[PDB]
From a paper:
Cytosolic purine 5´-nucleotidase (cN-II; EC 3.1.3.5) dephosphorylates purine nucleotide monophosphates with canonical activity towards inosine monophosphate (IMP). The cN-II protein assembles into functional homotetramers, with each subunit comprising 561 amino acid residues. The cN-II structure possesses the overall fold characteristic of the haloacid dehalogenase superfamily: an α/β Rossmann-like “core domain” and a smaller “cap domain. Whole-exome sequencing studies have recently revealed that somatic missense mutations in the gene encoding cN-II ([name]) are associated with relapsed acute lymphoblastic leukemia (ALL).
In this study, we describe the biochemical and structural behavior of the three most common mutants: R367Q, R238W, and L375F. Crystals of all three cN-II mutants belonged to the I222 space group with one molecule per asymmetric unit. Overall, the spatial arrangements of the mutants were almost identical to that of the wild type. The R367Q mutation is located in beta-strand 14 (amino acid residues 367–371) in the proximity of helix A, which is a crucial regulatory segment of cN-II. The replacement of the positively charged arginine residue by a glutamine led to loss of residue 367 hydrogen bonding interactions with both the carbonyl group of S40 and the carboxyl group of D459. Consequently, D459 formed a compensatory polar contact with K361, a residue located in helix A, as illustrated in Fig. 2a. Interestingly, interface A also includes helix A (amino acid residues 355–365), which was well defined in all the mutant crystal structures. Helix A is formed only in the active state of the cN-II enzyme, and the stabilization of this region in the mutants is consistent with their high catalytic potency even in the absence of ATP. In particular, the R367Q variant adopted a fully active conformation that exhibited higher thermostability than the wild-type enzyme.
Numbering used by the authors:
A (entry chain A), B (entry chain A), C (entry chain A), D (entry chain A): 3 to 402, 417 to 488
Write the structure that this text describes.
Amino acid sequence: TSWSDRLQNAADMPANMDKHALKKYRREAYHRVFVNRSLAMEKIKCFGFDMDYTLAVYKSPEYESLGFELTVERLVSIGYPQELLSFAYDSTFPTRGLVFDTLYGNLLKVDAYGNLLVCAHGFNFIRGPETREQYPNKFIQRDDTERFYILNTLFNLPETYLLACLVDFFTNCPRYTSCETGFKDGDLFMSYRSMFQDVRDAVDWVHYKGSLKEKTVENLEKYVVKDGKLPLLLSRMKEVGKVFLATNSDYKYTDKIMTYLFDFPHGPKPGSSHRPWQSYFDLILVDARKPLFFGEGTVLRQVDTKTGKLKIGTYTGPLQHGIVYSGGSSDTICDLLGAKGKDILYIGDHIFGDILKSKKRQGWQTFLVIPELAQELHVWTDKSSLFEELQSLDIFLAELSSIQRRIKKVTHDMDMCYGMMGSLFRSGSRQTLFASQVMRYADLYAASFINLLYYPFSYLFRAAHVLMPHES
Amino acid sequence: TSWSDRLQNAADMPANMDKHALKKYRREAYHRVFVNRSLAMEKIKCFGFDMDYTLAVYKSPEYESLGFELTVERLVSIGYPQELLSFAYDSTFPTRGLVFDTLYGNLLKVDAYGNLLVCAHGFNFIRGPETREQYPNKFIQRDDTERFYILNTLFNLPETYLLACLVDFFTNCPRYTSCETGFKDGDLFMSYRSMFQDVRDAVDWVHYKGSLKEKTVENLEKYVVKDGKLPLLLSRMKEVGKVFLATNSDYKYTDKIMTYLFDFPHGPKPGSSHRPWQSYFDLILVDARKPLFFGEGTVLRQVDTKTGKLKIGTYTGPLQHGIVYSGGSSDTICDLLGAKGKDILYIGDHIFGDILKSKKRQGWQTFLVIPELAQELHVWTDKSSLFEELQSLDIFLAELSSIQRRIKKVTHDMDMCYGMMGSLFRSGSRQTLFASQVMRYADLYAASFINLLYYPFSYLFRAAHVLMPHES
Amino acid sequence: TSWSDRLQNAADMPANMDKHALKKYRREAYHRVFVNRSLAMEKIKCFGFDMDYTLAVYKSPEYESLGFELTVERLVSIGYPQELLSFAYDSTFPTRGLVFDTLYGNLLKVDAYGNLLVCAHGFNFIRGPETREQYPNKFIQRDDTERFYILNTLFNLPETYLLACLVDFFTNCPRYTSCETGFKDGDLFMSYRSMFQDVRDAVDWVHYKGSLKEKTVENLEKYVVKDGKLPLLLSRMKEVGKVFLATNSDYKYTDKIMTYLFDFPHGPKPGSSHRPWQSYFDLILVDARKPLFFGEGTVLRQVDTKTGKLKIGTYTGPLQHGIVYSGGSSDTICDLLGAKGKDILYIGDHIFGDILKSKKRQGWQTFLVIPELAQELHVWTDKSSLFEELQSLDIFLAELSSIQRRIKKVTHDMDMCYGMMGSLFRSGSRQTLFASQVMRYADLYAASFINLLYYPFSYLFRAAHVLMPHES
Amino acid sequence: TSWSDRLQNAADMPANMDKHALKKYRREAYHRVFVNRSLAMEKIKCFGFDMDYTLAVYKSPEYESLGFELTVERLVSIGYPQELLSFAYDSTFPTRGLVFDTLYGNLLKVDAYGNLLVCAHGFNFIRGPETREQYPNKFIQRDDTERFYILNTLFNLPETYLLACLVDFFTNCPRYTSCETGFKDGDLFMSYRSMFQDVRDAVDWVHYKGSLKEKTVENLEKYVVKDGKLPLLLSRMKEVGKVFLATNSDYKYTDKIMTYLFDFPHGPKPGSSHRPWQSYFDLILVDARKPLFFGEGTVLRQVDTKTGKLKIGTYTGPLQHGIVYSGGSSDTICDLLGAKGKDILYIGDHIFGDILKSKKRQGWQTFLVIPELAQELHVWTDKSSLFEELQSLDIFLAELSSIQRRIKKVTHDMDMCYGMMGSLFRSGSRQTLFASQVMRYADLYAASFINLLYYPFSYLFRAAHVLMPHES
C-alpha cells in the first residue's frame, strides 16, 4: 500500500457532513490536521493553492517510475551507457530530503544541524566509523550549495534513486576505475559532480521539453488521484473567503489537470450541476515562477484562454471575472484580492520553495501537504512499541555498552519499516532537517488538504505555547 | 539591582568545591546552566571563548552610559545640535534585540516570524490599530537589511536608547517639521535612514577611534566585573581539555582587560601562586574578525607581544608555547589544536555573530552567555503569578471581549516589570525573535559561563526529545 | 550586387600562384589585407579560426531573409499578430552595429563616444533638433546594458530590420495607442523593452531550437559561399604552422558545413586527392562558448565523432590525431599546441566576442573578417569624389551657414549610397563605434581571410607608428 | 629642473593680453594646448575643475618626498624594520603609470595591449629573455585587478619608488630568503601581495588620517605652485560661461589651499581689488567621491562654511549664492547649472578617475592636465635627433641584426634622458598605456590648464580626421 493508495481510498468515500460524523472522523490520525502554531480559521479571508502534489497528487510509485524511465532514456540518448536501460525504479529506496554530496558521491540523511544520520554510497550503507574518513566531524555545511544538493521535492524522488543506481553501476562496471571523487576511464574522468549535473539537467529536460506531461495527460486515471470531495471543500471555502490558484505550471497543462480533477457528473455535491474548474477560483495565476514570485516576481501577463498563449502586453487592469493571469508576484494577489498576509492560508507541498518563502517573505499562514504522511502515519502507529522501547532505552542510558548496541539495533529495525532510507521525519530518536523545517514553517500540516473538510468553518487550531528551558 | 550587580554579588563568593555543596548550589536558577539540546561534557575536548561580555562582563548601566555619552559627543562634534548634550542614558528603556525601522523611525520588538509585538516612535508606544497604518499586516520582512537593522548586541544598547532620544528630540523641536520618513528643516531633509547611519557610524567611531577603550582601561573597577572563580574554572577546564581565546579585539586591549581579570594575589585557588593570564590558554587569537573567521577568515599573523604590533609575514609554523596569533579562521583552531567541530564548546555572547555561525558553519557546540538573564530570572520568579494568570486566560479564551482586554492588561503589567520594552525573551505569551534564536542555536545558556563550575567534569546536560505534532 | 556576390565571384577564380601575379592581385583594394598594427607573419606559429561568417560565409540577403522569416513565424506562433507575416526582409535598411534603445524604441547609429549620428523610430529618420527631446545631449551611455543593446553581429541583421518593422507596425495599427515607452491596447501595455526581449528570445530560439540549421543544411548552395581556394590557403598555413578551429557551433552542424566547404573533386589544388576537412586542422574544438572560452571556459570534453554525442567524462589526455574536443578554454589551445599568445593569429568575424576578448584577455594577434567590406569598398571607391568634397567643406568651414547645410546634404547623399543606415564605418566625416573597435582590436582586417593567400609566407604587414599631438 | 620648476617659472610671468603677443606665446610648445579631438570653445557653456594637481599643483620633488617620508614612517610605526628610515625619495626612478605585479613583485611599463616594455625587480632592470621566465608571452592581463595595480596618479609616485625600495631592501637583507612570490623569514612569509597591501594602506592613511595635509598647509610656499594668472583666467572663463569646482577633498582643506592660490594683493589683474576665491565659482562641490560621482554619487549635502561641518539633512533647495555643496553627483551639476554634457569642459589630472569617467559616462568634454609634460616637452625637443634616428632605423629594418642591437641601444639612451623608467608616453618607438588613454579620453591636454589663457574666447581647437586603413 503506497501513500497514494491511502489517499485514493479516502478519496473514494462520499462526504457525510453531519456534525457528529465530522467530529468523529477527524479523531482518526489519518483525517486530522496537525498544528505547529495556533490558527483561527475564522480570520482567514483567502485560501490559496499550488497545483502539483497539492490539488493534483500524482499516484505512487507509478508517476515516480515514469519520471525515472524518461530521465534514464534522456541520459542514454545523450551518451550514457545502454546498461542504464536495465534499471527499474524502486520506491523502497528513496526517502525525500536526502542530500547529494557531489564531492564523494554519497546520499546523506541529516538532522537540522547538518549531523549525519545515514550515509549511502550507491547501495552501500556506510557505518559510523567508516563515515569519519570522509566526514571527520560527521557533519556537513548544508548551505555549501556548490557541493551539496538537497533533494526536497516529490519530483526529486526518481533522481534520488537514479543517483544511487548510477554510483552503484559505475562502481561495479569493470570498464571504470573507482576514485575518491568520481570514475576514471582511461583519459576520461567523470566526477560525481559532472554526473549529478547531467542527472539534474535530464530531469529538468523531461519536465520541460520531454514527454512527461504528454504521457501523464494521456492517462490521468493511472497517474493522478481524483476525489469527489475536492469540489465540495473548495465550494465551502468560497462561501467564507476568496480562493486562488498560483502555480508554476503553464495554462495548457493546468487546464488539462484541473479539468480532470473536476470531471464528475456533478458539481460540489452529488445531484448538483457540474461547474467548470475555473468557477471555483476568484483568481487563477499560472507561470508563477515561485520562489521569485514571493519577491520581485515577473511582469503580470494575461492568458488568452482560447489559444493558451499570452496576450501581447503587461496586464494593467483590475480583477475581472474569467481572466487568467500569468507571472506577477505575491503582491498581485494581495492587491487584486484585497488581502494582507495573515489573512491568507496558502496550501502547498513545497516546504522550501513556497511554504518557507510565503511565511518568511510575506507573513502568509501556511498549510503543508505531505503526501507520504498518509502512509508514514500507518507505520508510526503500527510500530509505536518500537519507538516507545527506543525512548525508554535513551532514558535508561542517560541515567547513570549493551544498551548502545541495542539502541542501534532498534533504531535500524524501526527505520527499515519505512524504507531503506528511513522515515521522512527521523532516524530513530533523531529528527531530520525536513521534520525541523515542517515544524518551523508549516502552521498546519496533513497528508492531504482535504482534511480541512472535517473541521467547521471557524475552528480554532490550537498548539501549546513554547517555553524556554529557564521558563519551564 | 542591575544584572551586573547580580553577577558581581555571585562573583564575590568564594568557591566551595565540596560535592554536595556544588549539587545544592546549581539547584538555584541563578547558578544553573539551561539546556536546549543534550550535551555530554565528557566528550568536549576544547573550550573556546570570546572576551567582551563573556570573560569581560561590562558593568551596567555604567558602561552603556559611557558608550552613550561618547556617541552623543561624537554626533555633536560632527554637527548635531547642542541639545543632544542634555540627554542622559536610561537603562529602563532599551531591551536588546529590537529592530530599527529606518523608513518610519520606529523601534520594533518582533517574534521569530516578524510579527509586531511592540512599536515605539521616539518615546510614544503605538497601540495595535495605529500600528496598522504603517504596518498593514503587523509584520516586517526582517531580512530586508536595507530597511531594518536588528540591535542584537550588548554594545547596541546605548544606540537603542539614543535612536529613540533623537526621534523624540526632532519630533518635539519646533525648528523641525515631522514627516513620515524624517524631518524637514527648510531646504534640508533628514531622513530617519540618514540619522540612523550617523548614529551607527558614531558608535563605530567611539569603539575604534574614540576614547571608549582608554576610558574603560583607566577605571576597570568601575567598568568590568571581576571574579576570583574565573581562574579556578579555566584551570579546571585545562585539566580535561584544551582552552582557547578567539576575540575580535586587538592584543593591547585584550592584554589590559585580561590582566585585570586575573589580577588577584593568587592563582586558581586562594593560596596558590599567581600565574599570567596567557598561561590559562593553549591558543590565543586576537583580531579574529568574526563572523568572517567562520568562513575564509583572514591571513594568519603573529603578534609581537613586546610591542603589540604584528610581525612581518603570514605565520606558517606550528603551535608554539607563548605565541599569540592574529586573524586566521576557525580552521586554524581546529588544525592547531587537533579538534573537530563537535569536540569544541564555544562560549560567547554574540547569538548571531559567533554562536549561530560557529554552529551552522562549523558544527561547534555552543554556550551562550546572556548577562541580562541574571536579573530577568529574578523578575520571572517574582512575577510567576502574573505569567500563570496569563496562561490561564489564554486557555479559558481558547475554550469557547472582557477576557481579551484583561489579557492585554496583564501582558502590559508583566512586561513593565522588565522595563519599557519588556523582557528580552517575550511580550506576554509571545516569544521574541531573540528567544527563538537562543533556543535554536545555543546548546547551553546561562547568565554567566562561570555556572559551569558547579557541574562535574563529565556531566551529561539533558534536554527532552522533540516530537512532531503527529508523533505526540 | 551584395557583398556575398563579390565574395563568390572572387571565390570562383582559380589561384594563380606565380609570384608576380600574386603581387599584382593584392594591389587591388578588393584582395588586400588592411593593417592597423604591424604584424610579422614569419613569427606566427598557429592560425586559429571561427567557423560561422569566417570559414562559412552565409550568402546575402538569402540567409538574413531566412533568419527573418523564421523569427517572424516564431513570434506569430507565440501570439504576435498575423500581420507580421506580411513583412519581408529588406537588406537596404539595416547596417550592422546599431544600438536599440529599449526605453524609446529607436535604432541609433553612434560614434565611439556615444554621440548620435542617426536616429530612426520605426522607419522615421528623426532630424537633429527632434532628437534633442529624448536625447538632450545627443549622447547615450552605451554600457547601460539594461537600456541599450548593440546589434554588432551578422546574425543580428534580421532582428535589426525586424525591430524597425515592429515599431512601424504598432505605430500605424489603429488597435494600438503610441506612448513614449511602448504601445497601449486597453488594459495591456507592451513596452519597447518587452517587445525587444521577445524578438531577442525568438532569434535565439530559431538558432538553437528552430529550423534554421536544418533549412540551411538542406540547401547549402543557396546559403553558403564555397571557394576552391580555401583548402589551398589552409594547406599553405599548415606548412608553416599549426591550424585550429574553435567554434561555438556543435559537432553535427560543424561537420555538415565544413564537409560542404571542402566538397570539391580535389584536395588543396586541382589534380590533388580530396582529403577530409578534419585533416586540415591540428586541433578541432566545438561547443567553445566564446567569450567565456577566453576566461575560465568550461570543462574539456571529447566528441564521439561516430554519434556526434559527447563521451562520458572530462578529457585529461594529450593531443591525439583524430580527436575532436568540446568546451575547454583558450588555455587548452595554448597548452595542446605549445603556443603563447602573440604566436597565434586568430581569424574571426565577431569584433566584440572573439577578436576583442582574444586580444585583451590573451594577447592573441587578430584578423577580422568583415564580409560587408567586399561591397563597401566598391562604394567607397565609386563615391570617393563625394567624400573628398566632404573633407574640403569641413576644412573650408574650419578656416574662418550655406556651408553647414551643404555639409548635411553631401553627408546624406554619400550615406544613402551604402543603405538607409549608411556605412558600417561612418556617417559622413564621423566614424562609427564599429570603425573605432575595428581599428583598436583588429591587427589585420579584410572582406575575407582568403586574401592572406596573396601575400608570401613571411610577409611583414606594416602600419605607420602613431604619434601624440605634442610629438607630431 | 623639475616639471614644477618649469610651471613656476611660467607662473611668475605677468600676462601680456595683447592679441599678437598671445598668438606668439602659444606658438611655443610649452604654452600650447594639444588637441586629440576638435573642440569649438564657443560652444562651451561651463568650465569645471578638480583641485589637486589641477588648480593646486604640488611642487616636485618636494611633495612626493614628503608623501614618501610619511608613508615610510607609518610602515615603521606598524612594525616594518628600522632600515626603512634610511630610504630617501629619488625622483629619477619613478615614471607614472607603472603596473605593480603583486605575484612576482615587479614594476612593469606596458603598452595599451599589455605588452611588456620595461620590467624591474627592485632596482634590477630585467632584460627581454629573462622576462620570459615569469611572462612567457611578454604580456599581462591588466584588468586582473587581484594581481596588477596600475599606479596612474601623481599621488602614486612616492609608492612607486617605495615598492622598488622595499623589494630591493628585502632581497639584499640577509635576514630574509628571496622566494618567487615573496620573502621567507623562518616561520613568517611575506608575500609581495601582502607587502603591497601594507604600502597602499599606509599611503591611504598618510592622506586621510596622518599629517600630510597639516604639513602641506603649514608651508604652502614650499609645496604648492602659485600663479597670479590663475585668477585672470578664471575671471575670463566666468565672462563667457559658468565655472564650477568638484573636488574629492574636504571643505577645510579646500579652503586653505584655494585661499593660498588666490592670495595676491589684487584680484584678476594687478591693480584690481582682491576677491575671495569662492567668488570665482558659480558652484562649489567638495567631498565629491569621484568616480562614484559620475554614476549614482552620494546624497547631496550642504557645508556650514563657518564650522567646516555638514549641516543636518540632504539639501533639496536651489542653487544659492554662497552655498557650498558636499557629495551629490555629476547630475547635480548639470541640473543646478542648466548644462548638458557636451556644454561642459571638465579640467583635471586624473586620466582614469575623472577624465575617462566624465567622458564615457556623461559625455563631458575634457582637458587633461599632465604636469610632467612641462619637462617632458623640453626632453622631447632637446633629444628629437635621437627619436628621428630611431624612426629611420625602424624604417630601414622594415624594408628588407646589427640594426636590431642599434635600435635597442638608441631606445635605451633616449629613454634614460627622461629617467630610469623612461618617458610617461613611450619606450623608444612604442607608446605606453598612459599615452593611449590620453589620446582616447582627453579632448585637449597640456602641462597646465593656464595655457587656455593664450587662446581667444571662441577659438576652434582642431585635430585631423581619422581614416581607417582601407579609407586612406
